[PDB]
Design a protein around this ligand. Structure first.
Ligand SMILES: CC(C)S[C@@H]1O[C@H](CO)[C@H](O)[C@H](O)[C@H]1O
Ligand SMILES: CC(C)S[C@@H]1O[C@H](CO)[C@H](O)[C@H](O)[C@H]1O
Lengths: 269, 269
């Protein structure tokens, strides 16, 4: 009944929604939630957060923070026996984890653009320090290669809208104009959509955009953003229930994958 | 040492940025931060959070949660002997508080639009359960009335983009068509800008928009959003500094007003 959440920056909209979805499940169950924010990137920042949560005697940890394989294991060891569930890891890491299907996410975005007839596709990845950014990049490569398509550009942002603006602007100023972009989050897609629009092009007709997350604002971007919905409500419910199953010792104990879906809006065409 | 933050929903961009700005400054000083999220709405929810935080034995409280005068006073009494700082209150309450100048935010928005020759001004307020949304509405009224202008419409959203979209579409479908709108946050302004655009009109030239907060995304809206910037970095730094001063026994004891500024971008003309 006291869950600690260690989270990547709350300035990013997906972690804030996840935190809210966690609380909201914990509220149903009578559980309290404490949140500690991880001080930029690395296993040492994440361990720091974990100790600060254990410093208030949480009975369970939800770690929503990107950890490379060995890092996740270092972090799991430091959770010293207190139930810990990881939310931003590869499904290959031998720890308790609930992740969204990157295979599906990436397949859907790729297959959607392929069905729409795009052949000039650019990739705007998240920062490759993030395991989840890398999984989505890898997935786009997998499905594009299956489709016998190579991206015409692939860039890397930092998940923020401005990084999406800068990367898309620099891609465009290089003379590289895809007819569609697969973007690794909705915040970066917002930025890319601004780059596109300010370059005198129409989002959708000239450069379609597929985002990732369906974070809350996305239905009201201009135009509303076609995207890979990851249900953070489901993530919150699921992880809280699982955490509590763990602290009562009769839980599933590796990875679970949650499904995702494609929300068709107005930025594809 | 250990800063407990009680915060309204982190799913809204401004409380997230404020929480990130708090951590930022506390990281500079060596302090830890834990965050309790406040459940739904009202003083009883906020009091629980404060008691969650007290039970973690935090050495200092930052309450970023909208509290009308008497609810604020009730919450402050609930803080026991632990230094508490309120960020979402009016400056009339005899508690420790650091708030942005709503007088200046509203004046700035109103004067900017009047200065631009606008006479048909619609107001999109935050939810009126929020003391700060009421303070902004009140300031808009004050400065419009000074200018002997009556708003041609006034509506209420819930701080989300979609509320901004729903309210502005409802407005325009009623045949109420302003030449400018003062919106109580950037998220709703995003929705308002979507509504205006999808109604066949040009944000800026047809219907100018002023948002509120300068939250991170807004430099990337389409077109980028003219807004009342509230420096959450500043808020973070000032509130952590003042909390640790108070922690000792040597700080300013009442309200501090932080300045705000008008950031002119592309949504006014
Ligand atoms: C549970 C995560 C893989 S979701 C991941 O979180 C990131 C922050 O690390 C960014 O917010 C991305 O937009 C989001 O998809
Ligand atoms: C310090 C706060 C009054 S800023 C306030 O927070 C609100 C949520 O309570 C919304 O996020 C608004 O956009 C923001 O201006």
């Amino acid at each position: 009944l006291l869950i600690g959440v260690a989270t990547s920056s709350l300035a990013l909209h997906a972690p804030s929604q996840i935190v809210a979805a966690i609380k909201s499940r914990a509220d149903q169950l009578g559980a309290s939630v404490v949140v500690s924010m991880v001080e930029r990137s690395g296993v040492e920042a994440c361990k720091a957060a974990v100790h600060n949560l254990l410093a208030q005697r949480v009975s369970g940890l939800i770690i929503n923070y990107p950890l490379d394989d060995q890092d996740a294991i270092a972090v799991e060891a430091a959770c010293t026996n207190v139930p810990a569930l990881f939310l931003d890891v590869s499904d290959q890491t031998p720890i308790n984890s609930i992740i969204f299907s990157h295979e599906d996410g990436t397949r859907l975005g790729v297959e959607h653009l392929v069905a729409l007839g795009h052949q000039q596709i650019a990739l705007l990845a998240g920062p490759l320090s993030s395991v989840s950014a890398r999984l989505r990049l890898a997935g786009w490569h997998k499905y594009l290669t299956r489709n016998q398509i190579q991206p015409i550009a692939e860039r890397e942002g930092d998940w923020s809208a401005m990084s999406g603006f800068q990367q898309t602007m620099q891609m465009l100023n290089e003379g590289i104009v895809p007819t569609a972009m697969l973007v690794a989050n909705d915040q970066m897609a917002l930025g890319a959509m601004r780059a596109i629009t300010e370059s005198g092009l129409r989002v959708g007709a000239d450069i379609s955009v597929v985002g990732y997350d369906d974070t809350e604002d996305s239905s009201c971007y201009i135009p509303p953003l076609t995207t890979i919905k990851q249900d953070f409500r489901l993530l919150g419910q699921t992880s809280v229930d699982r955490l509590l199953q763990l602290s009562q010792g009769q839980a599933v104990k590796g990875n679970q994958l949650l499904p995702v879906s494609l929300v068709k809006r107005k930025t594809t065409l």
